């Protein structure tokens, strides 16, 4: 509709993790609303295919320009400058208006009894240090105002942990805590978290392989909706946050009712 | 966008409290999307005015049709019947797809030291008994599926009480509890709560108006009073995200951080 | 210091005849406090009262008394609560109040619920604790040394199918606590939210099915076992001692909330 | 010190990481009043001296309670896992540890967000997150996983009420709470919990910053270390409580 369109037409949106899954669907919604979308990822092959997919999305507002950049989020010595370059690129000729930091990763970490300091800090680098640094650099490329937003991603497993996942559960709690600290330190910019549940992404399919349909019966049994989330469903939550200039400091839970059980 | 119109075009939406404030702005957004709005109020003049305000809305979709229906939420002997009639109207010739229960809920109650049992029960009737009775009657007019949603309203004062408001704080906590119980008992229907704060509505606003606003602006991190149209986007979002159920969506300008 | 926080203090336990309330009363008199238990059945009150006077670990100075109070009789509710508070104040003032949960049985289906049924839950779970708060200042100093503790339940967050009315009022108790923590400051007001506790009442209800239900609860927990009333009663005693804690919901529910 | 409370703790081994001062010291007091064996740990050796001597000469101490100390620097990364392992081995002694308390890293404002560096981010995490993570790694070697025992971590009210300039600390306080829940599952049926204190007056802290907290609270006063210490003791005794954040912060969270 025109008011959603006017909320976001011509606005720059950076989507870290936009190659597939939730980020890609956010990118689709962004350009359907007339916004400029910059997607970032770790894989140039994946990034290239996602980028053409967006350019010829038939529901793309013709006005929407799509661009891409490759950014390595585990390279500690160059992380701040890589992130600084990404934001420069995303700002382009003006300023960034909305940042989405997606987290679509769940690879079970080693057993607690074997975890190492190196392993701990790697998850933190990706889950904690990088979002902090984007916040540090952000005022150069984005106006701190409530028309703009910076959105992070945690997960329902922060509240309902699976056994074997304590390192990841811990940094998920850290993302939600970081959001709250940043909502104060970056005011009047709006900072929020989306906390998704089980989402049926292509990589989720591929991981589970033959084990897919078992895991999905579990997730449906655990939900109250009785069905697995579409990435398109979850992406609406990030778009809502862009539109509502009143929402900041909160964790938006879109997880099929699993948290009720 | 086409995606959003496709989700809501032709859907029956009941806004309880749609004559003014957030409910009115929710009615606006849903008719922009081609949905069939039915607004309910307690004041017939206010209704007719709002109903007419809506029917003339500029961005209104031509196919969107608006109706109104009076319903006193405090008349306990007739409450179940009025809600049943209201539900029957909003369904029309098919079914209701989305129910929004909004409230302009901020008139301060009597002091704790003086509050009486009928005063407690009167807030209990509007805040708790009425949403429960909508839930009781809802399956007759509405399918229990995750395409559909039923959204209640609490408020940031549920978490940040002001002195004098303990009775309204309590029943806000009851609204949020009720939502979670209903999200289970009525599954796979989706049931949620929107918890607004720092929104300026006509009824809310006159001379003291700008004192309290400054208390909200200073308490917030947006440094800005919010328009009903901002908060309305939360109700619309819940209608669209067929994954969201059982949660309290907090749109209150960052006041909860401070 | 911590040994004398409770010695000589006047405690009121509403629902002190069995289960959690009774175990609170036990801990209270072990610490030397004066306990007034309230309940709805004079015979069960009588049994509870004797069992507390006879408690071997009761501090000698600790005096126990009882009072009957129908929390569903609306026309007499405010006066009955006033009389209960007068009693518990003894010859000085109340210092701590505990209000244990109704622990009701499953209500009728949602499609069957009536206004009368809704308000009856509200009377016991919301109106009665509200009226205690209204009346309290006449009999009790509003200060951080004293405390007023309500009771919700882990099913406030994890609803059981068919219980929406009880789940709703459980969230009302928690909201009321927060409202009261503000309107009654600097008195401390808190909520204990217990999970699966094996009270004597419970074992009668489940009866033959008890071992099924206890393996279910154990499976949902991370402790792997069912809580004792004496375990949960430690939380109420804690709140009485920590003069810094107010406005919060204390969750003691075996880790079920992690699942 | 009731018989019921002493039975629960008498003879138990309790490790208190950060027991030299403040909340940790007060927990050490309460546990030895119960006849439990307290082992305190600290970064500063003669600050341990003070504490260790002060503890040992406490008036309400159960005659049978023993006290002992150890140093452990939670920032020295090359030596962190071993010093923690050595610490745990000490507290277990000739049996097992029964209760662990990890008292929080203190409230020193970090650099302004605009100037924070990766080295700065990672050192708050080493102490607030890595160290308790490593204690959990090593614990099973020295502690039984049963609901009679507990591992208690510490976050803080600023996890939910940030102050300007504290985003890094608020960040890892949420990490501590998330870690507690994950460990509450991974280490079941051991009980793991978080105490979240607020408005607490300790000597390293101890008038404008003290009236300011009083105005945000509903108790209207600054709480003592001895009040919040009761929370840690409660969690030891309630064999039903796990996976939760116990908020003892004077009602500041209501405002």
Swiss-Prot record, chain B:
Pathway: Alkaloid biosynthesis. Its EC number is 1.1.-.-. It catalyses: 1-hydroxy-3-{[2-(1,1-dimethylallyl)-indol-3-yl]methyl}-6H,7H,8H-5lambda(5)-pyrrolo[1,2-a]pyrazine + NADPH + H(+) = 1-hydroxy-3-{[2-(1,1-dimethylallyl)-indol-3-yl]methyl}-4H,6H,7H,8H-pyrrolo[1,2-a]pyrazine + NADP(+); 1-hydroxy-3-{[2-(1,1-dimethylallyl)-indol-3-yl]methyl}-4H,6H,7H,8H-pyrrolo[1,2-a]pyrazine = (+)-premalbrancheamide. It is an enzyme of class 1 (oxidoreductase). The chain crosses the membrane at residues 10-32. One of its GO terms (cellular component) is membrane. GO terms for molecular function: oxidoreductase activity. The keyword Ion transport does not apply. Pfam families: SDR. This is Short-chain dehydrogenase/reductase malC.
